[PDB]
Amino acid sequence: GSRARVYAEVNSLRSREYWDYEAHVPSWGNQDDYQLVRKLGSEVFEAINITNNERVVVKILKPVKKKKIKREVKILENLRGGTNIIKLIDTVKDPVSKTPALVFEYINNTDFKQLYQILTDFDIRFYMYELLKALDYCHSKGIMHRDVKPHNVMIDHQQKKLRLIDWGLAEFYHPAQEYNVRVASRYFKGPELLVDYQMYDYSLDMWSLGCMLASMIFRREPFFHGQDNYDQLVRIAKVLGTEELYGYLKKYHIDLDLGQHSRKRWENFIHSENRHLVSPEALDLLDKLLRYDHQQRLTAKEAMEHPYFYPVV
Ligand SMILES: O=C(O)c1cccnc1
């Protein structure tokens, strides 16, 4: 088996009300207090609260879903006021359609496709640090995000603001609990998910964070571009090495079902167009995040102490 190295028992130490999301009963206000003005790139809208003129974000939930609405609302409520976590303002329902929606603080996202082309080395350090603050917070609150990717990391580069959003895939970590491995987006799935290892933990988010770092400093996005679930692991093995994949599988007693490849040096991904983004310290932090062995990956708190972030601290 396996368990998390840092916040393993925090949900156990809390009231059952904290993590028993199925017993959670949201109070649904009236969505007609909100004017949905601009569809953002679930259907998500920039909106105005018509009573106080406040600019907000309204995310329309899938009505049919019951359990995942309860889970997302409870997690957002537990995480409210956490650093760089999107702030849930209200839970409302449309009068006509009775469809549930969530109201959030507004953030003006730049869109990573254009943003990642103009980021400096410092910016990447800066925003990775901001994102790690979010992850250490939510992990410390016993929650795995399980969908960390550029699309769920809002960045307002004008105001230098970051919000980790979209907690509809998030779950409470309980030691030895077996989780669905088909969470997250293909490109940001840790190998533990891809080899069907169900007793994963917060470190899954640390893999995803590493993919983001690699794509940003190397300007290859997504960094691990699998064509389907299977190929996703081959893409990873093409970098971390096929023989090292087996060593990981032999550990944790995991039965795999590719080719030969051998582990690449992170330095081999450097060329003229990303050399000014890559440093030895970025590559060392990267090597400690993008590791087969989920127990060896830095925790968010450990990653924040890495020399990579000294200039940001
Ligand atoms: O999905 C969310 O939680 C979300 C989406 C856009 C903006 N704020 C939050």
Short mmCIF file of C-alpha atoms and ligand atoms in Angstrom, two decimals:
data_model
loop_
_atom_site.label_atom_id
_atom_site.label_comp_id
_atom_site.label_asym_id
_atom_site.label_seq_id
_atom_site.Cartn_x
_atom_site.Cartn_y
_atom_site.Cartn_z
CA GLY A 1 0.00 0.00 0.00
CA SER A 2 0.80 3.72 0.16
CA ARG A 3 -0.16 6.83 2.12
CA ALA A 4 0.64 10.55 1.86
CA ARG A 5 3.87 11.79 3.45
CA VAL A 6 2.54 15.03 4.96
CA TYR A 7 -1.15 15.58 5.61
CA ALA A 8 -2.13 11.97 5.84
CA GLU A 9 -4.61 12.07 8.72
CA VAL A 10 -5.94 15.65 8.72
CA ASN A 11 -9.48 14.73 7.66
CA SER A 12 -9.57 12.08 10.44
CA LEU A 13 -8.70 14.79 12.87
CA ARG A 14 -11.60 16.94 11.74
CA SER A 15 -15.33 16.65 12.43
CA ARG A 16 -17.06 14.19 10.06
CA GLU A 17 -19.18 17.14 8.88
CA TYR A 18 -15.99 18.50 7.32
CA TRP A 19 -15.45 15.73 4.79
CA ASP A 20 -18.80 13.87 4.65
CA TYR A 21 -19.94 15.88 1.63
CA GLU A 22 -22.95 13.67 0.81
CA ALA A 23 -24.65 14.86 4.01
CA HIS A 24 -23.97 18.47 3.07
CA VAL A 25 -27.07 20.51 2.31
CA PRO A 26 -26.46 23.67 0.28
CA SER A 27 -28.81 26.62 0.60
CA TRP A 28 -29.73 27.71 -2.91
CA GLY A 29 -30.34 31.42 -3.40
CA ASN A 30 -31.94 33.09 -6.40
CA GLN A 31 -29.76 33.29 -9.52
CA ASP A 32 -31.91 36.14 -10.86
CA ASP A 33 -29.85 38.38 -8.62
CA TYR A 34 -27.12 37.84 -11.22
CA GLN A 35 -26.82 39.21 -14.73
CA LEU A 36 -24.78 36.87 -16.90
CA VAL A 37 -23.02 39.20 -19.29
CA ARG A 38 -20.06 37.42 -20.89
CA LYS A 39 -19.43 33.73 -21.56
CA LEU A 40 -15.85 32.94 -20.47
CA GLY A 41 -13.47 30.82 -22.56
CA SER A 42 -19.73 23.71 -17.39
CA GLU A 43 -20.86 27.06 -18.75
CA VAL A 44 -19.04 29.89 -16.98
CA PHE A 45 -19.96 33.59 -17.16
CA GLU A 46 -18.62 36.94 -16.11
CA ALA A 47 -21.61 38.41 -14.29
CA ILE A 48 -22.91 41.38 -12.34
CA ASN A 49 -24.62 41.05 -9.00
CA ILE A 50 -27.50 43.40 -9.81
CA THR A 51 -28.12 44.38 -6.17
CA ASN A 52 -24.63 45.75 -5.39
CA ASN A 53 -23.10 46.06 -8.89
CA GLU A 54 -20.26 43.69 -7.94
CA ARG A 55 -18.48 41.92 -10.76
CA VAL A 56 -18.50 38.14 -10.26
CA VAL A 57 -18.20 34.78 -11.96
CA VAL A 58 -21.14 32.44 -12.26
CA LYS A 59 -20.56 28.82 -13.12
CA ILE A 60 -23.59 26.80 -14.15
CA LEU A 61 -23.56 23.28 -12.75
CA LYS A 62 -24.95 20.15 -14.37
CA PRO A 63 -28.38 19.72 -12.75
CA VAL A 64 -28.63 15.94 -13.03
CA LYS A 65 -25.52 15.64 -10.93
CA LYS A 66 -26.30 15.53 -7.21
CA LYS A 67 -23.22 14.01 -5.52
CA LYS A 68 -20.58 15.97 -7.39
CA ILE A 69 -22.43 19.23 -6.73
CA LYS A 70 -22.48 18.45 -3.01
CA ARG A 71 -18.78 17.58 -3.13
CA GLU A 72 -17.66 20.66 -5.06
CA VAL A 73 -19.68 23.04 -2.84
CA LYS A 74 -18.41 21.48 0.38
CA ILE A 75 -14.80 21.58 -0.77
CA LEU A 76 -15.11 25.23 -1.89
CA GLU A 77 -16.67 26.10 1.44
CA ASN A 78 -13.85 24.31 3.34
CA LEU A 79 -11.27 26.12 1.20
CA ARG A 80 -12.84 29.58 1.39
CA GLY A 81 -10.25 32.25 2.18
CA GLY A 82 -7.37 29.93 1.34
CA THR A 83 -4.49 31.61 -0.48
CA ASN A 84 -5.01 31.80 -4.27
CA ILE A 85 -7.98 29.48 -4.12
CA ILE A 86 -11.01 30.77 -6.03
CA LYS A 87 -13.49 32.16 -3.50
CA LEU A 88 -17.04 30.80 -3.50
CA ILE A 89 -19.43 33.71 -2.91
CA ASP A 90 -22.86 32.19 -3.35
CA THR A 91 -24.80 29.08 -4.32
CA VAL A 92 -27.90 29.85 -6.36
CA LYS A 93 -30.51 28.25 -8.61
CA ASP A 94 -32.26 29.55 -11.70
CA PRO A 95 -36.01 30.09 -11.05
CA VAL A 96 -37.07 28.79 -14.48
CA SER A 97 -34.73 25.81 -14.95
CA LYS A 98 -33.95 25.04 -11.28
CA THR A 99 -30.35 24.39 -12.39
CA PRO A 100 -27.76 24.99 -9.64
CA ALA A 101 -24.96 27.50 -10.09
CA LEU A 102 -21.97 28.69 -8.07
CA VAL A 103 -20.98 32.32 -7.69
CA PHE A 104 -17.26 33.17 -7.48
CA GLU A 105 -15.00 36.22 -7.14
CA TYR A 106 -14.04 37.61 -10.52
CA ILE A 107 -10.58 37.13 -11.95
CA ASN A 108 -9.60 38.36 -15.41
CA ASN A 109 -7.65 35.43 -16.94
CA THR A 110 -5.05 36.11 -19.67
CA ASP A 111 -5.29 32.68 -21.38
CA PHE A 112 -2.20 30.54 -21.03
CA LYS A 113 -1.64 30.01 -24.77
CA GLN A 114 -0.62 33.66 -25.18
CA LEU A 115 0.70 34.17 -21.64
CA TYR A 116 3.24 31.35 -21.66
CA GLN A 117 5.00 32.93 -24.67
CA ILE A 118 5.85 36.19 -22.90
CA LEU A 119 6.61 35.02 -19.36
CA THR A 120 10.07 35.72 -17.98
CA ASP A 121 12.02 33.30 -15.78
CA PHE A 122 10.97 35.36 -12.75
CA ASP A 123 7.28 35.25 -13.70
CA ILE A 124 7.30 31.45 -13.94
CA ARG A 125 8.95 31.26 -10.51
CA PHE A 126 6.43 33.82 -9.26
CA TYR A 127 3.29 32.09 -10.49
CA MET A 128 4.54 28.59 -9.64
CA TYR A 129 5.09 29.89 -6.11
CA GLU A 130 1.58 31.36 -6.03
CA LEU A 131 0.15 28.06 -7.26
CA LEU A 132 2.11 26.12 -4.64
CA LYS A 133 0.56 28.30 -1.95
CA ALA A 134 -2.85 27.15 -3.15
CA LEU A 135 -1.86 23.48 -3.21
CA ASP A 136 -0.17 23.46 0.18
CA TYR A 137 -3.27 25.10 1.59
CA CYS A 138 -5.78 22.70 0.07
CA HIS A 139 -3.59 19.64 0.78
CA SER A 140 -3.35 20.86 4.39
CA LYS A 141 -7.16 21.01 4.34
CA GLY A 142 -7.13 17.34 3.32
CA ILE A 143 -8.14 17.97 -0.28
CA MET A 144 -6.58 16.80 -3.55
CA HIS A 145 -7.37 19.02 -6.54
CA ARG A 146 -6.86 16.22 -9.09
CA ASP A 147 -7.18 18.52 -12.14
CA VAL A 148 -4.25 20.88 -11.97
CA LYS A 149 -3.64 22.22 -15.48
CA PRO A 150 -3.22 25.62 -17.16
CA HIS A 151 -6.96 25.83 -17.83
CA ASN A 152 -7.68 25.60 -14.08
CA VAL A 153 -5.05 28.10 -13.06
CA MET A 154 -6.41 31.62 -13.66
CA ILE A 155 -3.71 34.21 -14.12
CA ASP A 156 -4.23 37.96 -14.22
CA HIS A 157 -0.82 39.03 -15.43
CA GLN A 158 -1.77 42.69 -15.24
CA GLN A 159 -2.41 42.49 -11.50
CA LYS A 160 -0.02 39.54 -10.93
CA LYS A 161 -2.91 37.51 -9.44
CA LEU A 162 -3.44 33.75 -9.43
CA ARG A 163 -6.45 31.60 -8.65
CA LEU A 164 -6.67 27.82 -8.70
CA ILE A 165 -10.18 27.06 -9.96
CA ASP A 166 -12.48 24.20 -10.99
CA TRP A 167 -12.76 21.99 -7.88
CA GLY A 168 -15.41 19.75 -9.41
CA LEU A 169 -12.87 16.89 -9.60
CA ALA A 170 -11.42 17.49 -6.13
CA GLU A 171 -11.65 14.90 -3.31
CA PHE A 172 -10.93 14.43 0.38
CA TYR A 173 -7.84 12.42 1.16
CA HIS A 174 -8.34 9.50 3.55
CA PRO A 175 -5.40 7.10 4.06
CA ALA A 176 -5.76 3.76 2.20
CA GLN A 177 -8.90 4.98 0.38
CA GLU A 178 -9.01 3.75 -3.19
CA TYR A 179 -9.82 6.51 -5.67
CA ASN A 180 -10.96 6.67 -9.26
CA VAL A 181 -7.81 6.84 -11.40
CA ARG A 182 -9.56 8.39 -14.40
CA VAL A 183 -9.58 11.86 -12.98
CA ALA A 184 -7.68 14.88 -14.35
CA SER A 185 -6.94 15.69 -17.95
CA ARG A 186 -4.87 13.17 -19.89
CA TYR A 187 -1.83 15.40 -20.27
CA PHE A 188 -1.48 16.05 -16.53
CA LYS A 189 -2.19 12.56 -15.19
CA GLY A 190 0.51 11.13 -12.96
CA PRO A 191 1.87 7.70 -13.84
CA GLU A 192 0.20 6.32 -10.68
CA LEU A 193 -3.17 7.01 -12.30
CA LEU A 194 -2.06 5.65 -15.65
CA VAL A 195 -0.95 2.30 -14.18
CA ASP A 196 -4.24 2.07 -12.25
CA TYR A 197 -2.80 2.67 -8.79
CA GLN A 198 -5.82 3.69 -6.69
CA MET A 199 -4.25 4.52 -3.36
CA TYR A 200 -2.82 7.79 -4.57
CA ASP A 201 -2.66 11.03 -2.63
CA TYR A 202 -1.86 14.75 -2.71
CA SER A 203 1.32 13.98 -4.65
CA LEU A 204 -0.82 13.49 -7.77
CA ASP A 205 -1.23 17.30 -7.76
CA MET A 206 2.54 17.63 -7.48
CA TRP A 207 2.99 15.62 -10.68
CA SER A 208 0.52 17.90 -12.44
CA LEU A 209 2.35 20.95 -11.10
CA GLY A 210 5.57 19.54 -12.61
CA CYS A 211 3.95 19.18 -16.04
CA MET A 212 2.99 22.83 -15.83
CA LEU A 213 6.51 23.87 -14.85
CA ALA A 214 8.05 21.83 -17.67
CA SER A 215 5.65 23.22 -20.26
CA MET A 216 6.40 26.76 -19.06
CA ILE A 217 10.20 26.63 -18.86
CA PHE A 218 10.61 24.47 -21.96
CA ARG A 219 7.75 26.09 -23.89
CA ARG A 220 6.37 22.69 -24.87
CA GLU A 221 2.69 22.65 -23.95
CA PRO A 222 1.41 20.22 -23.00
CA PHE A 223 4.75 18.74 -22.05
CA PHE A 224 3.55 15.14 -22.11
CA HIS A 225 1.28 15.01 -25.13
CA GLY A 226 -0.24 11.51 -25.21
CA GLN A 227 -2.68 10.66 -27.99
CA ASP A 228 -4.80 8.51 -25.64
CA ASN A 229 -4.51 7.14 -22.06
CA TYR A 230 -2.04 4.41 -23.05
CA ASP A 231 0.18 6.60 -25.20
CA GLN A 232 0.26 9.11 -22.32
CA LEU A 233 2.42 6.70 -20.34
CA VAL A 234 4.65 6.01 -23.34
CA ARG A 235 5.24 9.78 -23.68
CA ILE A 236 6.26 9.86 -20.04
CA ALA A 237 8.48 6.79 -20.38
CA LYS A 238 10.16 8.41 -23.37
CA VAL A 239 11.44 10.96 -20.85
CA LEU A 240 11.68 9.31 -17.46
CA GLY A 241 12.84 6.06 -19.12
CA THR A 242 11.19 2.69 -19.71
CA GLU A 243 13.44 0.71 -17.35
CA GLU A 244 12.75 3.21 -14.56
CA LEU A 245 9.02 2.79 -15.11
CA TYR A 246 9.42 -0.94 -14.27
CA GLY A 247 11.43 -0.19 -11.15
CA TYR A 248 8.54 1.93 -9.94
CA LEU A 249 6.04 -0.80 -10.84
CA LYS A 250 8.14 -3.44 -9.04
CA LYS A 251 7.97 -1.22 -6.00
CA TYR A 252 4.37 -0.84 -4.70
CA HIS A 253 3.72 -4.28 -6.23
CA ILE A 254 2.04 -2.98 -9.41
CA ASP A 255 1.14 -5.20 -12.36
CA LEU A 256 1.76 -3.43 -15.68
CA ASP A 257 0.35 -4.76 -18.93
CA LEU A 258 5.87 1.12 -24.97
CA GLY A 259 9.31 -0.14 -26.02
CA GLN A 260 12.80 0.70 -24.80
CA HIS A 261 13.79 4.33 -24.28
CA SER A 262 16.17 5.14 -21.39
CA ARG A 263 15.93 8.23 -19.19
CA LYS A 264 16.62 11.63 -20.80
CA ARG A 265 18.59 14.42 -19.16
CA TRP A 266 16.30 17.39 -18.43
CA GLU A 267 19.07 19.44 -20.02
CA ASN A 268 18.28 17.73 -23.36
CA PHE A 269 15.06 19.75 -23.63
CA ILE A 270 16.93 23.04 -23.81
CA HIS A 271 17.32 24.85 -27.10
CA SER A 272 17.60 28.46 -28.25
CA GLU A 273 13.97 29.35 -27.64
CA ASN A 274 13.79 28.33 -23.99
CA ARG A 275 17.35 28.68 -22.65
CA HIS A 276 16.49 32.05 -21.09
CA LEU A 277 13.70 30.34 -19.09
CA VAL A 278 15.68 27.32 -17.95
CA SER A 279 18.16 27.29 -15.06
CA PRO A 280 19.91 24.51 -13.17
CA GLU A 281 17.64 25.12 -10.18
CA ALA A 282 14.48 24.92 -12.30
CA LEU A 283 15.73 21.57 -13.62
CA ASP A 284 16.42 20.27 -10.11
CA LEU A 285 12.99 21.22 -8.82
CA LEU A 286 11.54 19.72 -11.98
CA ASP A 287 13.40 16.47 -11.43
CA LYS A 288 11.94 16.26 -7.95
CA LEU A 289 8.36 16.74 -9.11
CA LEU A 290 8.27 14.67 -12.30
CA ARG A 291 9.23 11.44 -10.60
CA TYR A 292 7.55 8.05 -11.20
CA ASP A 293 7.57 7.40 -7.47
CA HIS A 294 4.77 9.51 -5.98
CA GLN A 295 6.19 9.17 -2.49
CA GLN A 296 9.51 10.61 -3.61
CA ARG A 297 7.94 13.78 -5.13
CA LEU A 298 8.35 16.95 -3.13
CA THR A 299 5.34 17.97 -1.13
CA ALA A 300 4.03 21.45 -1.96
CA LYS A 301 5.52 22.77 1.28
CA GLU A 302 8.89 21.19 0.39
CA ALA A 303 8.78 22.57 -3.15
CA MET A 304 8.19 26.07 -1.77
CA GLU A 305 11.52 25.78 0.08
CA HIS A 306 13.40 24.93 -3.09
CA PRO A 307 16.19 27.30 -4.26
CA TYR A 308 14.17 27.89 -7.46
CA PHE A 309 11.95 30.20 -5.45
CA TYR A 310 14.62 32.14 -3.48
CA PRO A 311 14.27 35.19 -5.78
CA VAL A 312 10.51 35.16 -5.24
CA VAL A 313 10.73 34.74 -1.44
O1 LIG B 1 -14.80 26.42 -12.35
C1 LIG B 1 -14.58 27.29 -11.48
O2 LIG B 1 -14.53 27.07 -10.24
C2 LIG B 1 -14.31 28.72 -11.98
C3 LIG B 1 -14.27 29.00 -13.35
C4 LIG B 1 -14.01 30.31 -13.74
C5 LIG B 1 -13.78 31.29 -12.75
N1 LIG B 1 -13.81 31.06 -11.42
C6 LIG B 1 -14.08 29.77 -11.05
#
